[PDB]
Amino acid sequence: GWEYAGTYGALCGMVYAIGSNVISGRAWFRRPWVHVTSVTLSYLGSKLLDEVQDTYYLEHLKRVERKGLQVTEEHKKLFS
Amino acid sequence: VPEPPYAKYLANKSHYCPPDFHYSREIYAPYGGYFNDPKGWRTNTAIATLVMLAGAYAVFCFGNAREERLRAPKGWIPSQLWNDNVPTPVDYRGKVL
Amino acid sequence: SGHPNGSFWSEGTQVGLNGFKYGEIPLPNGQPRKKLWLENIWNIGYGGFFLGAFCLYYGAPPGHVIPSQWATPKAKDEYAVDMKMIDKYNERPDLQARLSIVLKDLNMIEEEAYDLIMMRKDYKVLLGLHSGRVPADLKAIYEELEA
Amino acid sequence: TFNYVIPYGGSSSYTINNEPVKAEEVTVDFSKEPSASSLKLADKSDWIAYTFNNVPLMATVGLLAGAHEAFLHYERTPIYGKRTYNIIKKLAPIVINKTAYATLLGAIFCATDALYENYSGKKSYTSGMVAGAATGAVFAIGRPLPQPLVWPLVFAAAPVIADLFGEVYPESMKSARGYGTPYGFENLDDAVPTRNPIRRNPHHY
Amino acid sequence: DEPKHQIPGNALDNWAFLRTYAKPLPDMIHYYYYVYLFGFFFVYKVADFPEYSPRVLVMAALIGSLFYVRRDWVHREFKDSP
Amino acid sequence: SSRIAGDTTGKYTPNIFSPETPMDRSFSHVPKNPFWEAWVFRRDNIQREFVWTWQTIFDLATFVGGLYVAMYATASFCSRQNDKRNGYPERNYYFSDSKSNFVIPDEREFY
Amino acid sequence: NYASLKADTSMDHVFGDSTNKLNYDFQLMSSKEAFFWNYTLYPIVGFPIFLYLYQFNKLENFEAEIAAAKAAKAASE
Amino acid sequence: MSLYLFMLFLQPLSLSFVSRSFSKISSLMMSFATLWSAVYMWFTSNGANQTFYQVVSWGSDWSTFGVCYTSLYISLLCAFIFPICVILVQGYRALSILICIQTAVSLSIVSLHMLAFYALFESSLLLFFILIGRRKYGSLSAAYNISIYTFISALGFLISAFWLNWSFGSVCALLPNEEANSFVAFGIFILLWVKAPLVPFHLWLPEAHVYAPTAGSVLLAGVLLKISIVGLHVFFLPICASSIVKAFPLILSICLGSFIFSSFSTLKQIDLKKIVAYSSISHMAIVFLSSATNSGLGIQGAVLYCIAHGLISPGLFLLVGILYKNTNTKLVFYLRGLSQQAPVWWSVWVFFMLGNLAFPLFPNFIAEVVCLSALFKNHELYAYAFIFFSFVGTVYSSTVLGRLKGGVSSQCVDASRLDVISWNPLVLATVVTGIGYM
Amino acid sequence: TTATIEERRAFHKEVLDIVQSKLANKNSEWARPEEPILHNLKSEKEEPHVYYHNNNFRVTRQLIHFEKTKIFEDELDKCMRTHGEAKYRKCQEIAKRFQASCRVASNLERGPNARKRDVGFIYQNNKLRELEKDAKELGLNNPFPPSSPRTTIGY
Ligand SMILES: CCCCCCCCCCCCCCCCCC(=O)OC[C@H](COP(=O)([O-])OCC(O)COP(=O)([O-])OC[C@@H](COC(=O)CCCCCCCCCCCCCCCCC)OC(=O)CCCCCCCCCCCCCCCCC)OC(=O)CCCCCCCCCCCCCCCCC
Ligand SMILES: CCCCCCCCCCCCCCCCCC(=O)OC[C@H](COP(=O)([O-])OCC(O)COP(=O)([O-])OC[C@@H](COC(=O)CCCCCCCCCCCCCCCCC)OC(=O)CCCCCCCCCCCCCCCCC)OC(=O)CCCCCCCCCCCCCCCCC
Ligand SMILES: CCCCCCCCCCCCCCCCCC(=O)OC[C@H](COP(=O)([O-])OCC(O)COP(=O)([O-])OC[C@@H](COC(=O)CCCCCCCCCCCCCCCCC)OC(=O)CCCCCCCCCCCCCCCCC)OC(=O)CCCCCCCCCCCCCCCCC
Ligand SMILES: CCCCCCCCCCCCCCCCCCCC(=O)O[C@H](COC(=O)CCCCCCCCCCCCCC)COP(=O)(O)OCCN
Ligand SMILES: CCCCCCCCCCCCCCCCCCCC(=O)O[C@H](COC(=O)CCCCCCCCCCCCCC)COP(=O)(O)OCCN
Ligand SMILES: CCCCCCCCCCCCCCCCCCCC(=O)O[C@H](COC(=O)CCCCCCCCCCCCCC)COP(=O)(O)OCCN
Ligand SMILES: CCCCCCCCCCCCCCCCCCCC(=O)O[C@H](COC(=O)CCCCCCCCCCCCCC)COP(=O)(O)OCCN
């Protein structure tokens, strides 16, 4: 689905590391290990979320076709 | 009351200032102070007059380029000496000059 | 009273500062005042804005910033065509009668004759002729006057 | 348009009409039609009948309010101490008076609404406004200065609110579908349904 | 010193009025029990009620809102008397 | 009794412990007045003295409602004139009861 | 802190005492008077509105009379 | 466009990484960079693209951003006026709040999705509650007023956006949709009714402005009121034109009544900030009416007048703030002799007040002329009503100037070097727009 | 006039073909069209491509009209300044043309609520002519002035 999920996820991981440092009263640069872990985990989670969303989009397309919605080839193209 | 140290930098009361009139000398106004008469006024006025004449020259150039006379003057006009776009004068009867 | 030495063209009687500009006290030895932190950034950023606006307004090609500038040559051409066409209209009274018929069907008054001539290529006329609202006589009338 | 030269929006031809096209090939409706009871109660033909059919609601609300207040009084009274007075004699006026006042106000509202609709002959907002105003006037008979103005307004406004969001709103927005192609725009190439979606079965509770 | 809002009333009279809320407080369970019981029976009965016009419903809601008495109001004014 | 707080050279320091009062921004503050302050308070908090009286209702209705009614009537007249001027059919306005559906003139159509 | 509430009496001999006070009660116009003056002045302000209403009424009445006469002439004939 | 949006996202980001001592310098440099990026966006906007100069999408309908005539002017105004707000504010907390508010507002103007528009404009709701309700100089009443008014109007707008997204299937402006529904039109309209103060929904504005910091007041009057005109041109007139034409007598009644009642209310004001706030409310009425006429003359006139107000009101609010810093008073009665005591402050004050009265050498004159012409295009009476009542603005402004101009004063209360630096861009911009470079 | 769904979808397909043909070759003047896309749609909003293209054509036309009006005004001002006191007789035609241009520019896209711009009082004069004709033929007395030969320098 979303073509910017990986970038978003990496930036959000940065958001987690900085936010956690700031909430606890430490500076943003403290606990450097947390930054790498957060960035990687958030990137992977964002990607996984995008596949999950795509999978359920395709399941829905299958269901609607079975019900009787006359989806065209272009519509079948909309759901990757 | 002992005048503050900065009061040395400030100017005195001018000749035109009435002796009784008291004004605060620290206040700055772009138009000038209460009675002005600064030292070096003669030079400032000469510079002003030069800037006035230069701007008059520029304004004259601009006007001459933009002054459009579409109807012939009844008689000779001073603009002919400086501007070449004046139509040839025609009198009341209609004769060209 | 009068002038200080009796002469109008005499040196001014005031030596010093007429007032303190911004309230700042002149340094005793003539040391320059330290500049404020923001002065350089403010002057660069705002001067850059105003200079960029000037360059865009004047440097840019016609029709990039001011759309009307692009239309000026085209308007001159349409003006020439319209002028020729109106001159022809004034001379030929047969065309006037046909347009008087076209105008009535379009809910327009006789005075709006010049207006019809001037809207030859406009959304209303172009799409009305295609759809059927405008009588097809108008097309021939326009062609008779070199479109 | 998003430009400064021509008016925004558009114009639609009044002469040209678009023939209606069904939203789907087969239409299954899960919305039940109004009951015969609803139509009977809604019938305002005979004002007395209309009033007597619709007062049960006002009576019930008055009874609930009176029961609430009576319970609040009863709960405070102490069981351990013997009371000289009879509690029911103290509490019965509360409930009776609340029910009577509520029923009277609802009767006034229903009567005036039916009488105006009959005399005017048309179903209109004014009928609700005049019924509300009359109810609010009866409510504020002896109240201080502001209340005579405020209650006729609040009461008149209430049928306006009911009419706008209970009757006009649904009929106004009946056509909108949400599936397939937008109601107005059927030329656009959107997936066309064989049957309408049935999100729930007709209710029965 | 700063300008302040004038308070209507005397200090001791206002405090006396405030002190009329300091009365034996019943537990809220007693009210809740009855409200739960009657509410359950009411919900069961509501399914059988005739369909009422929206205007009548709104008017009934208005009347109920106006006739509702806050629990504090009864508490302050309650007197154990005839 | 006073001293110059500001230093153009940039070597400005606040002498918080100076016996002499610094000529800081607070030197030029204007002295307030007990009665003016109470007037300001009364003017702002004028909702406290608001009372619903027949005179108040009369004045409000006559000027505010009266202006609103006059303005609506004028706007309705101007709309009617414009419709007659333009040649458009009577437009379906919100409160006007018109058995016509005309609202927006068709640009293609010639009126 | 607050400004002094003590006045200066240095110039009282030269320019007169401040004993004399204003007689105004600092209250505004009566409601009855205001209604009359608002409903008098505002129509004067809206003079164009009345001119437009007058002309429009005259035009519409003339047009209606013309139509009526046209109908009458188109009926018999 | 992409550069502008990136700089917008970088400005809040920069604060997280600054030293906490370099915050003000970094914020000023970022504001100037955002202004330069806005100039670049103007350079990369070709007039040849008549409809939308530039549209960018980042993967979804919500992330669709684009610039049009209204959007371009408002975005340039926001970028021009933000540096002044930045320099006027001190403290990391204040900077953070201001930078977040600015980012949300500037992203709202360029948004082309109604739901995204709502998401971005209303994000800055708590920040205004906290800013207007600050510990010593703030009022909780004003914060509650502004917050509740914004929430109720934006919720109505949100409900209308949800219906449009359900019915049409999309709520993006770029997709042509028309609706004749009056409930949906009212939902979209109520936001515009509240945000651009229109009687009787204008009460939130004066309270907020009086108890807001000078940076906050400058931002509010300068651009926050304009966000209504972007919503009208981009999210109301394209879809709900039929309802604006249906309700035109009512719209005109409410707009003229706002102009009259606001003018009369300005006469009873004793606080300089309240005077400037009520002047803004009066000025908003012409812009709203002109846009509602749905004519070329009206849309252009409304945007132009908005720019003129967005250049004249920040100036007055800045001068009022400078005066309050010098004197700790906003009561006109305490402030006297300002002509003699502050000749430099007074000159700029008089110039800005002349601008507020729509004199010919000011942008307000040209803008007013265009707006009045649009009203005259609709009806002659419409124009006459507005033109006649303009004298009330003169009476209050003249009375204020006269009270401030003369009297006896023992305090020299004039602007410092910093204060002149802050208004110089506004003065130059006012002059340039006044001479016809609108 | 009725439009069947088959015809509507046919036009939609044709519009898509027109878009595809436009897309094939780059054009810097894409949004300044010289010709409209002809259609018989009830609402232009139905076909988005037609709506945007026609709107861009209308904007182009209006810009051209505004510039033409400025040119007409310049010739009228020059003519007025050259003739002198003979301006009323000699500049009737130029003025007539300028006023016609002003009407075309203003009236074409006035808006939903705007009235027609009566430059030259042509509509008022026409109305007075009709009112006079009716009053005279029906024997009524007209309370309005009779139509005028000239009401303005031109119209
Ligand atoms: C976005 C859209 C939304 C949609 C979906 C969203 C998705 C939803 C879900 C997404 C969730 C995201 C948000 C949640 C984030 C998770 C929370 C979190 O961030 O961590 C919490 C947690 C909080 O830590 P804390 O705040 O200190 O409190 C814990 C207490 O210490 C308590 O102490 P304790 O008793 O509990 O101790 C246990 C624990 C906690 O202990 C500690 O944390 C102490 C510190 C650990 C040692 C330091 C780490 C060593 C290397 C880290 C690299 C940092 C680089 C920065 C500087 C460069 C230096 C050259 O010890 C561990 O670290 C266990 C992990 C084992 C690894 C330890 C290191 C092994 C040796 C290094 C491995 C490989 C070396 C390669 C390169 C080395 C240098 C680059 O952080 C960790 O536990 C760290 C985990 C792993 C450590 C780093 C390992 C990274 C591998 C090295 C880098 C190589 C590149 C990485 C790629 C390849 C991997 C091999
Ligand atoms: C990859 C290479 C690396 C390159 C970098 C690229 C990485 C990209 C992003 C990484 C940047 C780091 C993110 C920062 C995280 C922590 C920020 C923070 O704590 O704020 C205050 C913090 C200041 O900390 P502090 O002064 O040391 O004291 C704070 C103490 O901890 C407590 O102090 P206090 O108790 O006295 O609280 C007083 C409070 C007064 O009380 C309030 O006002 C409370 C109000 C509630 C929230 C405000 C509602 C409105 C906020 C609107 C959002 C602002 C953006 C507007 C744009 C519209 C977006 C739709 O005032 C404030 O705290 C500041 C007022 C304004 C800040 C509010 C904005 C923060 C929103 C949420 C923060 C994120 C936390 C996530 C937590 C993660 C794990 C725990 O940071 C700032 O410098 C200002 C905020 C910067 C905002 C950027 C954060 C993104 C949020 C926008 C949402 C968009 C979605 C996220 C996507 C972002 C890009 C993917
Ligand atoms: C024998 C046992 C005794 C119980 C008797 C019956 C037992 C229950 C049997 C069945 C119970 C189910 C049905 C009864 C009502 C449902 C409520 C419920 O059961 O909750 C549990 C409730 C206690 O729950 P709680 O959580 O512990 O107490 C929360 C409160 O804070 C309590 O604290 P608080 O009382 O100190 O505070 C009260 C507060 C609580 O607030 C409320 O009461 C909220 C209710 C508002 C409306 C409720 C929804 C209306 C929709 C009704 C749906 C049907 C119509 C359909 C269409 C209508 C569209 C709206 O309201 C007020 O401040 C007083 C004002 C009253 C309403 C405020 C609205 C005024 C608007 C009028 C405008 C005119 C003013 C203009 C001039 C103003 C000048 C500026 O128990 C009862 O109250 C039952 C007493 C039954 C009396 C109800 C009277 C009429 C009933 C139907 C009329 C519908 C309106 C409701 C009015 C008041 C209801 C509370
Ligand atoms: C939120 C709406 C609540 C109304 C707020 C008004 C102010 C409250 C004051 C209380 C007054 C009672 C409510 C009166 C409002 C109705 C407007 C009166 C207009 C009117 O009388 O015409 C009726 C139709 O208007 C109508 O009944 C439909 C008009 C819809 C009401 C106005 C909708 C927008 C108002 C929202 C403004 C700001 C919102 C904040 C509250 C008659 O019609 P007819 O068919 O009977 O013809 C007659 C054939 N017999
Ligand atoms: C409780 C709240 C309210 C209670 C108190 C309300 C008291 C106010 C009542 C009178 C207020 C002013 C009168 C205006 C309405 C009069 C009657 C309305 C009926 C009406 O529309 O008649 C038109 C009145 O003339 C007009 O078109 C308007 C003439 C008056 C406008 C100018 C007067 C003041 C000018 C001040 C500026 C205000 C307007 C600025 C644009 C002329 O009949 P028609 O030919 O249109 O036929 C239309 C079919 N009835
Ligand atoms: C089917 C339904 C039928 C209709 C039923 C209607 C029943 C009620 C509907 C009312 C909903 C409106 C919600 C606003 C309520 C007014 C504000 C509450 C008053 C108040 O005291 O708020 C204080 C400050 O608020 C303020 O300062 C705000 C001042 C007033 C806000 C103005 C409201 C916004 C504009 C109103 C309408 C606009 C358009 C409408 C479409 C904070 O009190 P506290 O924190 O100290 O709490 C301590 C407890 N006392
Ligand atoms: C009394 C003066 C009116 C005050 C308003 C003054 C100016 C507002 C104009 C806003 C411009 C666009 C708004 C469209 C209509 C709003 C008000 C128009 C007047 C009006 O109430 O007409 C009513 C119809 O409108 C309706 O049915 C809808 C009324 C608005 C609903 C109120 C709250 C809705 C909030 C919904 C939130 C979002 C919902 C989205 C699903 C009834 O007039 P009529 O045609 O029946 O004539 C029968 C009379 N004889």
Side-chain angles (χ1 to χ4, degrees), chain C residues 57-68:
Chain C
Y57 201 81
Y58 285 105
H64 182 94
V65 180
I66 306 154
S68 68

mmCIF file with all atom_site columns, all heavy atoms in Angstrom, chain C residues 57-68:
data_model
loop_
_atom_site.group_PDB
_atom_site.id
_atom_site.type_symbol
_atom_site.label_atom_id
_atom_site.label_alt_id
_atom_site.label_comp_id
_atom_site.label_asym_id
_atom_site.label_entity_id
_atom_site.label_seq_id
_atom_site.pdbx_PDB_ins_code
_atom_site.Cartn_x
_atom_site.Cartn_y
_atom_site.Cartn_z
_atom_site.occupancy
_atom_site.B_iso_or_equiv
_atom_site.pdbx_formal_charge
_atom_site.auth_seq_id
_atom_site.auth_comp_id
_atom_site.auth_asym_id
_atom_site.auth_atom_id
_atom_site.pdbx_PDB_model_num
ATOM 1  N N   . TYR C 1 57 ? 8.953  39.949 -9.786  1.00 0.00 ? 57 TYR C N   1
ATOM 2  C CA  . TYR C 1 57 ? 7.953  40.801 -10.419 1.00 0.00 ? 57 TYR C CA  1
ATOM 3  C C   . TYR C 1 57 ? 8.446  41.313 -11.764 1.00 0.00 ? 57 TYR C C   1
ATOM 4  O O   . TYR C 1 57 ? 7.682  41.374 -12.734 1.00 0.00 ? 57 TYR C O   1
ATOM 5  C CB  . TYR C 1 57 ? 7.598  41.972 -9.505  1.00 0.00 ? 57 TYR C CB  1
ATOM 6  C CG  . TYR C 1 57 ? 6.261  42.601 -9.818  1.00 0.00 ? 57 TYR C CG  1
ATOM 7  C CD1 . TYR C 1 57 ? 5.081  42.043 -9.352  1.00 0.00 ? 57 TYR C CD1 1
ATOM 8  C CD2 . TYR C 1 57 ? 6.183  43.751 -10.590 1.00 0.00 ? 57 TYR C CD2 1
ATOM 9  C CE1 . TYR C 1 57 ? 3.861  42.618 -9.641  1.00 0.00 ? 57 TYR C CE1 1
ATOM 10 C CE2 . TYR C 1 57 ? 4.970  44.331 -10.884 1.00 0.00 ? 57 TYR C CE2 1
ATOM 11 C CZ  . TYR C 1 57 ? 3.811  43.762 -10.408 1.00 0.00 ? 57 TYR C CZ  1
ATOM 12 O OH  . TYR C 1 57 ? 2.599  44.341 -10.702 1.00 0.00 ? 57 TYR C OH  1
ATOM 13 N N   . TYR C 1 58 ? 9.718  41.693 -11.841 1.00 0.00 ? 58 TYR C N   1
ATOM 14 C CA  . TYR C 1 58 ? 10.253 42.307 -13.049 1.00 0.00 ? 58 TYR C CA  1
ATOM 15 C C   . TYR C 1 58 ? 10.997 41.330 -13.953 1.00 0.00 ? 58 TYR C C   1
ATOM 16 O O   . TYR C 1 58 ? 10.812 41.360 -15.172 1.00 0.00 ? 58 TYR C O   1
ATOM 17 C CB  . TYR C 1 58 ? 11.151 43.488 -12.679 1.00 0.00 ? 58 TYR C CB  1
ATOM 18 C CG  . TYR C 1 58 ? 10.337 44.685 -12.251 1.00 0.00 ? 58 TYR C CG  1
ATOM 19 C CD1 . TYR C 1 58 ? 10.235 45.043 -10.915 1.00 0.00 ? 58 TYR C CD1 1
ATOM 20 C CD2 . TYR C 1 58 ? 9.634  45.434 -13.183 1.00 0.00 ? 58 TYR C CD2 1
ATOM 21 C CE1 . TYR C 1 58 ? 9.475  46.127 -10.525 1.00 0.00 ? 58 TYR C CE1 1
ATOM 22 C CE2 . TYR C 1 58 ? 8.875  46.518 -12.802 1.00 0.00 ? 58 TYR C CE2 1
ATOM 23 C CZ  . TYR C 1 58 ? 8.799  46.860 -11.473 1.00 0.00 ? 58 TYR C CZ  1
ATOM 24 O OH  . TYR C 1 58 ? 8.042  47.942 -11.092 1.00 0.00 ? 58 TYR C OH  1
ATOM 25 N N   . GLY C 1 59 ? 11.840 40.470 -13.382 1.00 0.00 ? 59 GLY C N   1
ATOM 26 C CA  . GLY C 1 59 ? 12.626 39.555 -14.196 1.00 0.00 ? 59 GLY C CA  1
ATOM 27 C C   . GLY C 1 59 ? 11.818 38.494 -14.921 1.00 0.00 ? 59 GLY C C   1
ATOM 28 O O   . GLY C 1 59 ? 12.148 38.125 -16.052 1.00 0.00 ? 59 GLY C O   1
ATOM 29 N N   . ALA C 1 60 ? 10.765 37.976 -14.287 1.00 0.00 ? 60 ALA C N   1
ATOM 30 C CA  . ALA C 1 60 ? 10.048 36.839 -14.849 1.00 0.00 ? 60 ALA C CA  1
ATOM 31 C C   . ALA C 1 60 ? 9.442  37.171 -16.215 1.00 0.00 ? 60 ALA C C   1
ATOM 32 O O   . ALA C 1 60 ? 9.039  38.309 -16.470 1.00 0.00 ? 60 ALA C O   1
ATOM 33 C CB  . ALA C 1 60 ? 8.947  36.380 -13.896 1.00 0.00 ? 60 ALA C CB  1
ATOM 34 N N   . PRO C 1 61 ? 9.375  36.187 -17.110 1.00 0.00 ? 61 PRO C N   1
ATOM 35 C CA  . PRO C 1 61 ? 8.744  36.386 -18.423 1.00 0.00 ? 61 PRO C CA  1
ATOM 36 C C   . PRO C 1 61 ? 7.275  36.747 -18.303 1.00 0.00 ? 61 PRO C C   1
ATOM 37 O O   . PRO C 1 61 ? 6.635  36.463 -17.279 1.00 0.00 ? 61 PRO C O   1
ATOM 38 C CB  . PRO C 1 61 ? 8.921  35.017 -19.098 1.00 0.00 ? 61 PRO C CB  1
ATOM 39 C CG  . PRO C 1 61 ? 10.151 34.467 -18.458 1.00 0.00 ? 61 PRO C CG  1
ATOM 40 C CD  . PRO C 1 61 ? 9.984  34.851 -17.013 1.00 0.00 ? 61 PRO C CD  1
ATOM 41 N N   . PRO C 1 62 ? 6.707  37.383 -19.329 1.00 0.00 ? 62 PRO C N   1
ATOM 42 C CA  . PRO C 1 62 ? 5.298  37.786 -19.266 1.00 0.00 ? 62 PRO C CA  1
ATOM 43 C C   . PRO C 1 62 ? 4.380  36.574 -19.178 1.00 0.00 ? 62 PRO C C   1
ATOM 44 O O   . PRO C 1 62 ? 4.555  35.587 -19.894 1.00 0.00 ? 62 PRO C O   1
ATOM 45 C CB  . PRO C 1 62 ? 5.092  38.554 -20.578 1.00 0.00 ? 62 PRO C CB  1
ATOM 46 C CG  . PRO C 1 62 ? 6.471  39.016 -20.947 1.00 0.00 ? 62 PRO C CG  1
ATOM 47 C CD  . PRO C 1 62 ? 7.336  37.848 -20.575 1.00 0.00 ? 62 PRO C CD  1
ATOM 48 N N   . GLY C 1 63 ? 3.394  36.657 -18.290 1.00 0.00 ? 63 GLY C N   1
ATOM 49 C CA  . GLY C 1 63 ? 2.458  35.572 -18.090 1.00 0.00 ? 63 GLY C CA  1
ATOM 50 C C   . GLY C 1 63 ? 2.858  34.571 -17.031 1.00 0.00 ? 63 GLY C C   1
ATOM 51 O O   . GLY C 1 63 ? 2.088  33.641 -16.760 1.00 0.00 ? 63 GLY C O   1
ATOM 52 N N   . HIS C 1 64 ? 4.031  34.733 -16.423 1.00 0.00 ? 64 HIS C N   1
ATOM 53 C CA  . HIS C 1 64 ? 4.453  33.860 -15.335 1.00 0.00 ? 64 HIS C CA  1
ATOM 54 C C   . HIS C 1 64 ? 3.867  34.331 -14.011 1.00 0.00 ? 64 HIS C C   1
ATOM 55 O O   . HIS C 1 64 ? 3.323  33.532 -13.242 1.00 0.00 ? 64 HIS C O   1
ATOM 56 C CB  . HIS C 1 64 ? 5.979  33.802 -15.262 1.00 0.00 ? 64 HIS C CB  1
ATOM 57 C CG  . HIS C 1 64 ? 6.498  32.892 -14.193 1.00 0.00 ? 64 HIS C CG  1
ATOM 58 N ND1 . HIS C 1 64 ? 6.830  31.577 -14.433 1.00 0.00 ? 64 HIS C ND1 1
ATOM 59 C CD2 . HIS C 1 64 ? 6.740  33.106 -12.878 1.00 0.00 ? 64 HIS C CD2 1
ATOM 60 C CE1 . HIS C 1 64 ? 7.256  31.020 -13.313 1.00 0.00 ? 64 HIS C CE1 1
ATOM 61 N NE2 . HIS C 1 64 ? 7.211  31.926 -12.354 1.00 0.00 ? 64 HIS C NE2 1
ATOM 62 N N   . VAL C 1 65 ? 3.972  35.626 -13.735 1.00 0.00 ? 65 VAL C N   1
ATOM 63 C CA  . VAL C 1 65 ? 3.516  36.216 -12.486 1.00 0.00 ? 65 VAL C CA  1
ATOM 64 C C   . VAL C 1 65 ? 2.233  37.015 -12.689 1.00 0.00 ? 65 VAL C C   1
ATOM 65 O O   . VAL C 1 65 ? 1.273  36.864 -11.932 1.00 0.00 ? 65 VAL C O   1
ATOM 66 C CB  . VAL C 1 65 ? 4.622  37.095 -11.857 1.00 0.00 ? 65 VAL C CB  1
ATOM 67 C CG1 . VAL C 1 65 ? 4.140  37.707 -10.554 1.00 0.00 ? 65 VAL C CG1 1
ATOM 68 C CG2 . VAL C 1 65 ? 5.882  36.278 -11.635 1.00 0.00 ? 65 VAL C CG2 1
ATOM 69 N N   . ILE C 1 66 ? 2.197  37.866 -13.708 1.00 0.00 ? 66 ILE C N   1
ATOM 70 C CA  . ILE C 1 66 ? 1.009  38.649 -14.027 1.00 0.00 ? 66 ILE C CA  1
ATOM 71 C C   . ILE C 1 66 ? 0.356  38.028 -15.262 1.00 0.00 ? 66 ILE C C   1
ATOM 72 O O   . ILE C 1 66 ? 0.887  38.157 -16.374 1.00 0.00 ? 66 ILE C O   1
ATOM 73 C CB  . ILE C 1 66 ? 1.352  40.125 -14.260 1.00 0.00 ? 66 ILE C CB  1
ATOM 74 C CG1 . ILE C 1 66 ? 2.114  40.685 -13.060 1.00 0.00 ? 66 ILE C CG1 1
ATOM 75 C CG2 . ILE C 1 66 ? 0.091  40.929 -14.510 1.00 0.00 ? 66 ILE C CG2 1
ATOM 76 C CD1 . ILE C 1 66 ? 3.006  41.855 -13.397 1.00 0.00 ? 66 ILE C CD1 1
ATOM 77 N N   . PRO C 1 67 ? -0.778 37.340 -15.113 1.00 0.00 ? 67 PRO C N   1
ATOM 78 C CA  . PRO C 1 67 ? -1.414 36.693 -16.274 1.00 0.00 ? 67 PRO C CA  1
ATOM 79 C C   . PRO C 1 67 ? -1.871 37.656 -17.356 1.00 0.00 ? 67 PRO C C   1
ATOM 80 O O   . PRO C 1 67 ? -1.853 37.294 -18.538 1.00 0.00 ? 67 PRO C O   1
ATOM 81 C CB  . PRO C 1 67 ? -2.597 35.947 -15.638 1.00 0.00 ? 67 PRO C CB  1
ATOM 82 C CG  . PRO C 1 67 ? -2.167 35.743 -14.214 1.00 0.00 ? 67 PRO C CG  1
ATOM 83 C CD  . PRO C 1 67 ? -1.508 37.041 -13.874 1.00 0.00 ? 67 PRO C CD  1
ATOM 84 N N   . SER C 1 68 ? -2.293 38.869 -16.988 1.00 0.00 ? 68 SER C N   1
ATOM 85 C CA  . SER C 1 68 ? -2.775 39.829 -17.978 1.00 0.00 ? 68 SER C CA  1
ATOM 86 C C   . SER C 1 68 ? -1.710 40.184 -19.008 1.00 0.00 ? 68 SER C C   1
ATOM 87 O O   . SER C 1 68 ? -2.044 40.480 -20.160 1.00 0.00 ? 68 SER C O   1
ATOM 88 C CB  . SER C 1 68 ? -3.275 41.094 -17.280 1.00 0.00 ? 68 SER C CB  1
ATOM 89 O OG  . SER C 1 68 ? -2.206 41.807 -16.684 1.00 0.00 ? 68 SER C OG  1
#
